[PDB]
Write an enzyme that holds these catalytic residues in place. Structure first.
Site, PDB file in Angstrom:
ATOM      1  N   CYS A 108      30.632 -27.138  56.849  1.00 20.23           N
ATOM      2  CA  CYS A 108      29.401 -26.792  57.885  1.00 20.23           C
ATOM      3  C   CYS A 108      29.766 -27.751  59.205  1.00 20.23           C
ATOM      4  O   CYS A 108      29.997 -28.853  59.045  1.00 20.23           O
ATOM      5  CB  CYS A 108      27.791 -27.093  57.351  1.00 20.23           C
ATOM      6  SG  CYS A 108      27.502 -28.950  57.186  1.00 20.23           S
ATOM      7  N   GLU A 109      29.459 -26.903  60.266  1.00 19.39           N
ATOM      8  CA  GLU A 109      29.665 -27.497  61.418  1.00 19.39           C
ATOM      9  C   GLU A 109      28.843 -28.591  62.014  1.00 19.39           C
ATOM     10  O   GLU A 109      29.191 -29.092  62.961  1.00 19.39           O
ATOM     11  CB  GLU A 109      30.057 -26.586  62.458  1.00 19.39           C
ATOM     12  CG  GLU A 109      28.945 -25.980  63.105  1.00 19.39           C
ATOM     13  CD  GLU A 109      29.364 -24.589  63.954  1.00 19.39           C
ATOM     14  OE1 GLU A 109      30.607 -24.113  63.377  1.00 19.39           O
ATOM     15  OE2 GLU A 109      28.782 -24.203  65.124  1.00 19.39           O
ATOM     16  N   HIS A 110      27.777 -28.718  61.389  1.00 15.50           N
ATOM     17  CA  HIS A 110      26.660 -29.583  61.822  1.00 15.50           C
ATOM     18  C   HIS A 110      26.640 -30.999  61.262  1.00 15.50           C
ATOM     19  O   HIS A 110      26.187 -32.023  61.980  1.00 15.50           O
ATOM     20  CB  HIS A 110      25.424 -29.114  61.720  1.00 15.50           C
ATOM     21  CG  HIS A 110      24.806 -27.570  62.518  1.00 15.50           C
ATOM     22  ND1 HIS A 110      23.817 -26.887  62.275  1.00 15.50           N
ATOM     23  CD2 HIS A 110      25.633 -27.118  63.367  1.00 15.50           C
ATOM     24  CE1 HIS A 110      23.772 -26.006  62.837  1.00 15.50           C
ATOM     25  NE2 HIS A 110      24.974 -25.930  63.562  1.00 15.50           N
ATOM     26  N   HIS A 111      27.034 -30.980  60.164  1.00 15.39           N
ATOM     27  CA  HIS A 111      27.232 -32.181  59.369  1.00 15.39           C
ATOM     28  C   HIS A 111      28.619 -32.609  59.014  1.00 15.39           C
ATOM     29  O   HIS A 111      29.231 -33.793  58.440  1.00 15.39           O
ATOM     30  CB  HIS A 111      26.447 -32.567  58.328  1.00 15.39           C
ATOM     31  CG  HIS A 111      24.902 -32.689  58.812  1.00 15.39           C
ATOM     32  ND1 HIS A 111      23.848 -31.812  58.980  1.00 15.39           N
ATOM     33  CD2 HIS A 111      24.233 -33.904  59.183  1.00 15.39           C
ATOM     34  CE1 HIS A 111      22.870 -32.383  59.544  1.00 15.39           C
ATOM     35  NE2 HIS A 111      23.049 -33.856  59.554  1.00 15.39           N
ATOM     36  N   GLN A 149      27.506 -20.462  58.395  1.00 14.51           N
ATOM     37  CA  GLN A 149      27.698 -19.197  57.381  1.00 14.51           C
ATOM     38  C   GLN A 149      27.410 -18.026  57.819  1.00 14.51           C
ATOM     39  O   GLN A 149      28.236 -17.013  57.820  1.00 14.51           O
ATOM     40  CB  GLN A 149      26.871 -19.655  56.086  1.00 14.51           C
ATOM     41  CG  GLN A 149      27.253 -18.454  54.880  1.00 14.51           C
ATOM     42  CD  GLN A 149      26.344 -18.770  53.838  1.00 14.51           C
ATOM     43  OE1 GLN A 149      26.212 -19.787  53.206  1.00 14.51           O
ATOM     44  NE2 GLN A 149      25.918 -17.662  52.976  1.00 14.51           N
ATOM     45  N   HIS A 177      25.206 -25.418  50.279  1.00 12.25           N
ATOM     46  CA  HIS A 177      25.559 -26.072  51.445  1.00 12.25           C
ATOM     47  C   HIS A 177      25.278 -27.795  51.146  1.00 12.25           C
ATOM     48  O   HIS A 177      24.106 -28.158  50.792  1.00 12.25           O
ATOM     49  CB  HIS A 177      24.807 -25.947  52.716  1.00 12.25           C
ATOM     50  CG  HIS A 177      25.168 -24.597  53.167  1.00 12.25           C
ATOM     51  ND1 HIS A 177      25.703 -24.553  54.552  1.00 12.25           N
ATOM     52  CD2 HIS A 177      25.166 -23.470  52.681  1.00 12.25           C
ATOM     53  CE1 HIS A 177      25.905 -23.216  54.848  1.00 12.25           C
ATOM     54  NE2 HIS A 177      25.497 -22.564  53.841  1.00 12.25           N
ATOM     55  N   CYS A 179      25.121 -30.034  53.166  1.00 10.44           N
ATOM     56  CA  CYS A 179      24.302 -30.561  54.182  1.00 10.44           C
ATOM     57  C   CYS A 179      22.715 -30.779  53.717  1.00 10.44           C
ATOM     58  O   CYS A 179      22.033 -31.256  54.308  1.00 10.44           O
ATOM     59  CB  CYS A 179      24.478 -29.928  55.258  1.00 10.44           C
ATOM     60  SG  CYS A 179      26.384 -29.687  56.000  1.00 10.44           S
TER      61      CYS A 179
HETATM   62  N1  GTP Z   1      22.143 -21.332  60.330  1.00 10.91           N
HETATM   63  C1  GTP Z   1      22.611 -22.128  59.557  1.00 10.91           C
HETATM   64  N2  GTP Z   1      22.386 -23.441  59.597  1.00 10.91           N
HETATM   65  C2  GTP Z   1      23.070 -24.506  59.103  1.00 10.91           C
HETATM   66  C3  GTP Z   1      24.058 -23.890  58.351  1.00 10.91           C
HETATM   67  N3  GTP Z   1      24.906 -25.120  57.891  1.00 10.91           N
HETATM   68  C4  GTP Z   1      24.106 -25.836  57.983  1.00 10.91           C
HETATM   69  N4  GTP Z   1      22.920 -25.671  58.761  1.00 10.91           N
HETATM   70  C5  GTP Z   1      21.809 -26.467  59.361  1.00 10.91           C
HETATM   71  O1  GTP Z   1      21.829 -26.990  60.757  1.00 10.91           O
HETATM   72  C6  GTP Z   1      20.804 -27.977  60.593  1.00 10.91           C
HETATM   73  C7  GTP Z   1      21.183 -29.121  61.561  1.00 10.91           C
HETATM   74  O2  GTP Z   1      20.462 -29.337  62.721  1.00 10.91           O
HETATM   75  P1  GTP Z   1      19.662 -30.952  62.787  1.00 10.91           P
HETATM   76  O3  GTP Z   1      18.144 -30.814  62.868  1.00 10.91           O
HETATM   77  O4  GTP Z   1      20.314 -31.542  64.126  1.00 10.91           O
HETATM   78  O5  GTP Z   1      20.204 -31.471  61.420  1.00 10.91           O
HETATM   79  P2  GTP Z   1      19.426 -32.925  61.114  1.00 10.91           P
HETATM   80  O6  GTP Z   1      18.762 -33.349  62.381  1.00 10.91           O
HETATM   81  O7  GTP Z   1      20.264 -34.151  60.464  1.00 10.91           O
HETATM   82  O8  GTP Z   1      17.965 -32.565  60.014  1.00 10.91           O
HETATM   83  P3  GTP Z   1      18.252 -31.936  58.377  1.00 10.91           P
HETATM   84  O9  GTP Z   1      19.250 -31.097  58.246  1.00 10.91           O
HETATM   85  O10 GTP Z   1      16.956 -31.612  57.832  1.00 10.91           O
HETATM   86  O11 GTP Z   1      18.520 -33.293  57.665  1.00 10.91           O
HETATM   87  C8  GTP Z   1      20.584 -28.459  59.356  1.00 10.91           C
HETATM   88  O12 GTP Z   1      19.351 -27.894  59.130  1.00 10.91           O
HETATM   89  C9  GTP Z   1      21.402 -27.760  58.355  1.00 10.91           C
HETATM   90  O13 GTP Z   1      21.117 -27.646  57.151  1.00 10.91           O
HETATM   91  C10 GTP Z   1      24.602 -22.689  58.545  1.00 10.91           C
HETATM   92  O14 GTP Z   1      25.779 -22.437  57.766  1.00 10.91           O
HETATM   93  N5  GTP Z   1      24.008 -21.689  59.063  1.00 10.91           N
HETATM   94 CA    CA Z   2      24.525 -28.782  58.752  1.00  8.55          CA
END
Ligand code: GTP
Ligand code: CA
Ligand code: GTP
Ligand code: GTP
Ligand code: GTP
Ligand code: GTP
Ligand code: GTP
Ligand code: GTP
Ligand code: GTP
Ligand code: CA
Ligand code: CA
Ligand code: CA
Ligand code: CA
EC number: 3.5.4.16
Lengths: 219, 216, 216, 219, 219, 216, 214, 214
Positions: A108-111, A149, A177, A179
Site C-alpha cells: 500500500c502506498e500510504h504506509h 487497490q 491490507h 495497514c
Molecule cells: N482507498 C484506499 N485506501 C487505502 C488503501 N490502502 C491503504 N489505504 C488507507 O489510506 C489511509 C492513509 O491515510 P492516513 O489517515 O494519513 O493514515 P493514518 O493517519 O496513519 O490513519 P489510520 O490508517 O487509521 O491509522 C489509511 O486509512 C489506509 O488504510 C487502498 O488501497 N485504497
Molecule cells: Ca495505508
C-alpha cells in the site's frame, strides 16, 4: 526506448488516461539507487536504536534496498513488463475466459506495508487469445508497485484491454491490507474488494452478472 | 469548536435526520463521571451480595467505570471521531468499493450486554476515495455506543454519505446479541442482519443486487 | 526508573539470558527520531523515482516514520510494557491454562516486512493467576519489534516465566512470513511453527504432549 | 435453610475447599435489591450523558437490575440450584460417560462482560448415574455468576464429584472472553481453555489422555 | 379476559383467518389434567409391558405429563404468550430486518414426535421496531404445539403481522421430522422447508428474492 | 419359545448380567394393546384441549399406538430380533473390523422423547466373521426400546460378544437427547458419548487406543 | 383390481403419458427360478459355490431383486397416501430436500446412489411429508434411467396431489460410470422435471432451482 | 503356465495361505452363456426386453462380469510389476493413501465403494507407485468379502516386495447395507491388515494407524 512495443503501448495508454503510477525519470542507475537507499535505511535503523553490529541485522539495509528496487517495486520499471504471447482466435471463442484466484502481492502506498490478495480476471477474446500465464504476469507486474487497490484494478484492466485489442475485460481484486490489519485499527478480519469492468462487463447485465456471480463464490 | 470539521459535520447531519443517539449535554468532566460511576458500581456489587474484599473483585467497580467511559462507550464523544483522510478520485473508479467482514463490537442499549458482529460497507466514490481503515474506524466509532442495531446501521450509512460527499453507500451488519443468547430466550444459534442502502444501492436494482448478493 | 517493576524485571531477565533484541541506548527523543526517519524515507521515495507531489503519496514518509516509532516497533520501548495484574491462585488450579489463537503481527528483521501469525500460550499457575488479556498483551509487546520468530518465541516464554513466578510455561507460534511469500521464493502456501517449552512442558512428557497435541 | 440437601452438600463442599464465590449474606430481599440496583444504574446512565426520556432507554435500568439478580447472576442463590436426579448403576458402566459442547454463558468478574463458551464434562459412574440434563444444569448454574474461568472449572468439578459420590470426574471449558475481545487489546480471535481433572482423570494416563484427546477434536 | 392485549389480538386474528390450532375449552385446571395424563400414561407403559417398579421408569408418566402440559405444548395456552415490547421507528428503517437461524423445536401432530429445525424471519418496520428476542419468543410459542410445519409457518407470519402492524413479514422454516427419520421410511438425510410470505415479500419481486436468496444460506 | 436360538442366547445372557430392559410378560396380544393404547392417547389429547374433530388430528391416537408397539419400541419383542449369519474366519483376520457411523434412533425412557445418534462398533473375529449389516441390525434392535444411553451401549456390547463367540468387542455411541435439547435446559449444542469395551479393547492399551482414537 | 385407488390413478397416469417402466407367475415362483439361473452364472464365473460365504448367494440375489431393489415394479407395494385439507391455506411451495435415493442402472444392473429434492404448491390438500420420500423410493426400486425416473416421480405426485405445481430434481452417482468402463470417480448427474408454475413461472422456477443448488 | 512370474508367485502365495478367492471354458463362451441366463431373469422380472433401452442389457451384464468387475479372477489380468533398486536406501514407510477402490459384495452381488491406504518399508526394492493402485484394484475386481480382500492385498504386496513390512487399510460403503435391507445411509466399514513391523512394532504400527485416521 529499451521497451517492448507491448510495454510501450500499455504505458502510453495509462498516461493518456491519467492512470499511470506517480513517477519521475531516474538520473541515477538502479545499482546506485540501491546503494543510496541502503545508506538511508541504515540511518533509519540507527534511529530505531537497533544494534547493527548483530549478525542478524547487519545486512538488513542492503536486503531492504535490494527488495525495494529489484523485488517489490520492480513493476515501476517497464523493462520488467512481461513478454506478451497471443495466438489467433481460430477456435472463435465468444464467451468469457476466466482466470480466478490469481496470487497477488502488493504494497500500500500510504504506509509501505504488505497487501495480500487474489485477483480474478476475465475477458471475451476478439481476434486474439492470450497465453493464460501472461494474465497472472500482468496482474503481478502492476502489483509490484506502491499501490492503492482502486488504482491497481483500473491499471490491470486498461493494460489488458490494450494488449487484447478489446474493451471486453473485467478485473476484480480481493485483498487483506496490513495497514489495516497490523497497525492503526488492527482489524484482524476485514478484506477489501474492488472491481473494474469494461465493455460488455460494464454494460451488459447478463455478461456483467455472469462475471460478478462467479467471483462471489470464492471471495 | 473542539471537534474536527468532519466530526461536527457528521454530528449535525445525524441530528438533522433524527438519528443521533439519545444524548443530554455534559455537565461533568469525563474523569469525575468515571469516579462517580465507580461509586455506583460499588453499591451494585454490594447489592448483589458480592464480597469486595476479594482481591479479584476489589477493583471491578473502577474497571467497569473505566470501561464504560473510556472504551465501550467512547463513541458517545465526538472528540474520539476518527481522523479522516481522502485522496482525489484521479483513478476515476466508478464501480463499488466493498470492505467486508469489518470487526464490530457493540452493546445493546436495552440490557447493556455485548453485541458481536461483522459489518460490510460499500460505496461508489464520487470525487474522493477514502482511506480504507477509516471505514473500519467509522463503523467502530458508532458501535462504541449503547445501540439498537437498526439505528447503528443508519448512523454508519449517513456518516459515510456525509464524509464521502455521495449518497451511493450501503451498510450491512450481521450480529449475535447476547441479550438474546445469554439471557431470556437464550437462543444460542440465531443472529440478526440489518441493512441500510443509499442512492443507487437502494434504487438501482443491478447495484442493489450486486451489493446484497456479495454479502451472502 | 521510568519503567514499571514488571517491565524492568522482564528486561533484565532477557538481558541476563542473552535474549534481548539487539538494542543501543537512546540518544535522541522519540519525536525527533520520528522527524529524522521521515526525512530519510522522503529520500528513499525520491530514490525509487516516485512523485511526492501526488496527494496520495505526499504524506507517506511521515506515515511511515510514525508507524515505525509509535506502532509496529513500539515494543522496543519498555515504557509500553503492559500493566500486569495477578490474582492469588486461591482456587488452586494445578492444570494448564491455555490461551490459543492469539492474534500476532510482527516484522521480519531481515527484510522489514509483515509477519502474520497466531500464538498459543499455556502455563500451570503456581501462586498467581494472570489476567487473561495480559497474555495477549505480552505476546503483542514482543511482536511489535523487528523479529526472528525463533527469538520472539523465547522472549515471550521467558517474560511469562519471570512474571508468573514459575518455569511451567509453553509458547507456540505459527506464522506466515511475507519475506517468504511476497518476494524471493514467493512460497504462497508455507508457514512456520516454532515452540519454546519450559519446566514440565519441556521435561514432563504427559504435560508436554498435552500442550503439543492441543496446538495441532 | 430453604435449600435442597443436594444444594447444601455442594455449597459446604465448596466452602471447605476455599472455592465458593466471594459472597455475603443478604439483608435486603431480592425485589428490594433489584429496585436499589435499578436506581444506581439510572445514575450510571445519567453519568454517561444518556437521555433516559427516550422510549428505547427509559426501561434500561429496570431491565439491567432484573438481568443481574434473576438472570445472569442467578447462580449466586442456591435456591436456584437444579433438582438432582440419580438412578442406580444397575447396568454397571465403568467407562466414562462424556457430555460435550455444553452451552455455557457467564460473566467475567473483572469487567462484568459476557463470557461465551462450551464445557465438556466426563465422569466414571460408581453407584449412581446422573440424569444427563443435570450435567448441563450444574455447569450453567455455576456459570451464572461473575467468574474467573479457572475458578468456574474447579467449582463445577467439585460439585459433580460431590453429587455423584466419586472423584472420577473431569471438566474442560473453552471460552471467548469479551473483556479480551471487545475492549483493551481487542483480540478478535483468541480463546481460553481450562481443565480440572479429578481421580483417574488426573492420575491415570490412559483415562486422562482418553478424556483430553476427546476434547481436542472439537475445541 | 386473562390474556394480554397482544395475545388476544393474535389469537383472534388466527381464529378469523381459520388458522388457529384445533383447540377446545378446558373444563379442568392444568394440575388436574397433568394428574390424569399421568394416569393414562401410566397405563400405556403397562400396555407396553414395561416394568414400572424400575427406578429409572417409575416417574416417567409424571415426567411426560408435566412435559406435555407445561413444556412442549405450553404454546396451547395464551397465558404463555410472550410480553411484547416495541420502540418507535424513529431511526426510520425502511429495509428488511432479518433474524436467521432461530432455534425451533416442535412436535408433529400426526405422530407426536420431535421436529427439530431453524426459522428465519424478516420484516420491514413501519411504525415500530420489535425487540429482537421477541421474534425468537414468538417462533417458539407457536412451535410448542402439536404442529403441521406448513401451519406453524403461517401462524408465526400472521402473529407477527398482527403485532407489528404491517403486512410486510416473511417466515421460513427448515426442519427435520423424526416421524420421517426415526420411524416409517426412516430417511436419515431429508429435511423440509416451508415459506410464508406477506405483503411486499410475496408481491415485490426484489423484496421477495432478497429474502429468499438470503435464506438459501440456511442449509 | 418362539424365538431363534440366537435371540434366546442373547436374551438369556442379558438376563444373567442384569442388563435387560425392565419388562414383564404380556397378558394381552399386540393388537389388543394397540387398541387400548389408542384409547389412552385419545384421552391425553383430549386432556391437552386438542380438538379431535380436526381431520389432521383425528387419526393421531391410532398412529401413536401403532408407532409405539410396532415401530419405535419394537425392540422389546425378541421375535423382532435380526437373523444372524456368520461365515467362517477362513481368511484368518486378527485385527479389529470397525463399522462406524451406524444410524441409531432411540427413545429416552425418562421423557419418551427422541434420541438421535451414531454408533461405532468394532470386534476382533475369532471363529466367525459376521455379516456386516447384522451389526447395524443389532444396534437398531436394542435402540428400538425406551432406553438410557449407558444401558443401550452395554446391551449391544454383550449381545455382540455372545453371538460372535468372543469378548473382543467395542461399542461407542454419540447422541443428541431431545429431553435435553427440546425441553428443560434446552441445550441446542450438547451431545453425549458413551463407550463399552470388552476383552482386549478394555485392557490391551494398543487395541484400546486404536479403537478410541478412531472414533475420534 | 387389487391395488389402492391411488396406485391405480398413478399407474394409469403413467401408462397414458407413455412413461411407465417397460405378469404370469406369482412372486414366490419367480424367486426360485431367478435363484436357479444365478447359480449357473456363478458356475460360469468359475466361483466355488461350496464355500460357506458363497453357498447362499443365488437365493439372496433372487430375493433382493423381487422383494427389495425392484419391489417398485409391483403396485401392491405402492405406499399408502394420506392427505389433509389445506385449511391453513398454504400457497407457497413446500420443499423436501436431500431425500435418500437408491436405485439400479437399467443398462448394467448396477447401483445408482442419489438424493432427490421435491417441491409442490398445495392446492386443496397437504400430503404427509414422509409420503413424498416413499413415492420417490417406490419409483427408484426399479431398473431405471435417471431421466425417466424423474419424470415418473413428477407425474405421480401431480396425480396424487391434484395439482400440476410440482417439481422434482435428482442428483446421483451411477456406478455404471464410476466402477466400470470410464471409471470416472468424481462425476454425478442431475436431472430435473418441472410442472405447472415450476415450468412456466420464472420466479417459481428460479426459486426452486436456486434452492436446489444451495 | 501362461502367467507372469510375479502373478504366479502371488497366486501360489494366496493358495498356500488359504486366502485365495474360492476353469473349463474360455472367456468368450462364458459371456454368451451368462448373457442367455440374464435374459430369462429379466423375463422373470416382467421387464419388456423389446424396449430399446433394455434390449441390449443381458450382453452388457455378461461383458461387465467377465471383462470388467470380476476381471480380477483372471491372473492373466494381473498387473505388470516394475521394481528399482533401493539405491536411495529408504528405510521409513512409503504410504499411498486414498486409493480408489470399487468392488462387489460376494453375498448380494452389489457395489462396494471404498478407498484403500497402503504402506510398506522398502527393503531391497522400490515399487513403482501406480502398481500399488493396480494391485489393490486387481483384487477388488472380484466378488469379495472386505476382510478377505484386505488380507489378499497384503500378502500379494509382501510377496512382490520381498518384505513382510506392509500394511493395508480399507474404508468402504457396502450397498448391500445402504441400498437394501437395513438401508443404513451413513455407515462404513474399516478393515486393516498389518504385516511385519506394522503388526509388531508399536511405533511403526501407530504411525501407520495414526496416519490413516488423519
Ligand atoms: N482507498 C484506499 N485506501 C487505502 C488503501 N490502502 C491503504 N489505504 C488507507 O489510506 C489511509 C492513509 O491515510 P492516513 O489517515 O494519513 O493514515 P493514518 O493517519 O496513519 O490513519 P489510520 O490508517 O487509521 O491509522 C489509511 O486509512 C489506509 O488504510 C487502498 O488501497 N485504497
Ligand atoms: Ca495505508
Ligand atoms: N489461452 C490459453 N493459453 C494457454 C493455455 N495453456 C497454456 N497457455 C499459455 O500459453 C503461453 C505460452 O506462450 P509463451 O509466451 O511463448 O510461453 P513462455 O515463453 O514460456 O512464457 P511464460 O509462460 O509466461 O513463462 C503461456 O503464457 C501460457 O499461459 C490455454 O489452455 N489457453
Ligand atoms: N444418565 C442418563 N440420563 C438420561 C438419559 N436420557 C435422559 N436422561 C436424563 O434423565 C433425567 C430425567 O430425570 P428428572 O430429573 O426426573 O427429569 P426432569 O424432572 O424433567 O428434569 P430436567 O430434565 O432437568 O428438566 C434428565 O435430567 C435427563 O438428562 C440417558 O440416556 N442417560
Ligand atoms: N485469569 C483470568 N483472568 C481473567 C478472566 N477473565 C478476565 N480476566 C482478566 O483479568 C484482568 C483484569 O485486570 P486489570 O489489569 O485490572 O484489567 P485492565 O486494567 O482493564 O487491563 P486489560 O484487560 O488489558 O485492558 C484482565 O486481564 C482480564 O482479561 C478469567 O476468567 N481468568
Ligand atoms: N429492535 C431491536 N431490538 C433489540 C436490539 N437489541 C436488543 N433488542 C431487544 O430489545 C428487547 C428488550 O425489551 P424488553 O422486552 O423490555 O426486554 P425483556 O423484558 O427483558 O424481554 P426479553 O429480552 O425477551 O427477555 C428484547 O426483546 C431484545 O431482543 C436491537 O438491536 N434492535
Ligand atoms: N404435511 C405435513 N405432513 C407431515 C408433517 N409432519 C409429518 N407429516 C407426515 O404426515 C403423515 C401422516 O399420515 P399417515 O399416512 O397416517 O402416517 P403413517 O400411516 O404412519 O405413514 P408413514 O408416515 O409413511 O409411516 C406422515 O407421512 C408424516 O411423515 C408436517 O409437518 N406437514
Ligand atoms: N441417459 C442415461 N444413461 C444411462 C443411465 N444409466 C446408465 N446409463 C448409460 O447407458 C449406457 C449404456 O450404453 P452402452 O454403449 O451399451 O455401454 P457400454 O457398451 O458398456 O460402454 P460404456 O458405458 O461407455 O462403458 C452407458 O453409457 C451408461 O452410462 C441413465 O440413468 N440415463
Ligand atoms: N463380514 C462381511 N460381511 C459382508 C460383507 N459384504 C456383505 N456382507 C454381509 O453378508 C451378509 C449376508 O448374510 P444374509 O443373512 O444372508 O443377508 P440377508 O439374509 O439378506 O439379511 P440382511 O443382510 O440383514 O438384509 C449381510 O449381512 C451383508 O451385509 C463383507 O465384505 N464382510
Ligand atoms: Ca435487549
Ligand atoms: Ca527475511
Ligand atoms: Ca476481565
Ligand atoms: Ca430425560
Amino acid at each position: 526506448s529499451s521497451l517492448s512495443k507491448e510495454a510501450e503501448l500499455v504505458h502510453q495508454a495509462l498516461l493518456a488516461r491519467g492512470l499511470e503510477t506517480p513517477l519521475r525519470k531516474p538520473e541515477l542507475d538502479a545499482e546506485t539507487r540501491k546503494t543510496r537507499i541502503q545508506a538511508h535505511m541504515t540511518e533509519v535503523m540507527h534511529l530505531l536504536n537497533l544494534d547493527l553490529t548483530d549478525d542478524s541485522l547487519a545486512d538488513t539495509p542492503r536486503r531492504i534496498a535490494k527488495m525495494y528496487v529489484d523485488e517489490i517495486f520492480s513493476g515501476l520499471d517497464y523493462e520488467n513488463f512481461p513478454k506478451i504471447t497471443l495466438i489467433q482466435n481460430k477456435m472463435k471463442v465468444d464467451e468469457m475466459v476466466t482466470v480466478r484466484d490469481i496470487t497477488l502481492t502488493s504494497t500500500c502506498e500510504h504506509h509501505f506495508v504488505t497487501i495480500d490478495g487474489k485477483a480474478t480476471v476475465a475477458y471475451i477474446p476478439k481476434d486474439s487469445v492470450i497465453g493464460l500465464s501472461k494474465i497472472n504476469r500482468i496482474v503481478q507486474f502492476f502489483a509490484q508497485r506502491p499501490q492503492v487497490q482502486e488504482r491497481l484494478t483500473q491499471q490491470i484492466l486498461l493494460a489488458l484491454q490494450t494488449l487484447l485489442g478489446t474493451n471486453n475485460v473485467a478485473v476484480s481484486i480481493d485483498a487483506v491490507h496490513y495497514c489495516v490489519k497490523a497497525r492503526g485499527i488492527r482489524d484482524a478480519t476485514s478484506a477489501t474488494t474492488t472491481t473494474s469492468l469494461g465493455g460488455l462487463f460494464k454494460s451488459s447485465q447478463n455478461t456483467r452478472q455472469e462475471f460478478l456471480r462467479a467471483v462471489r463464490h470464492h471471495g
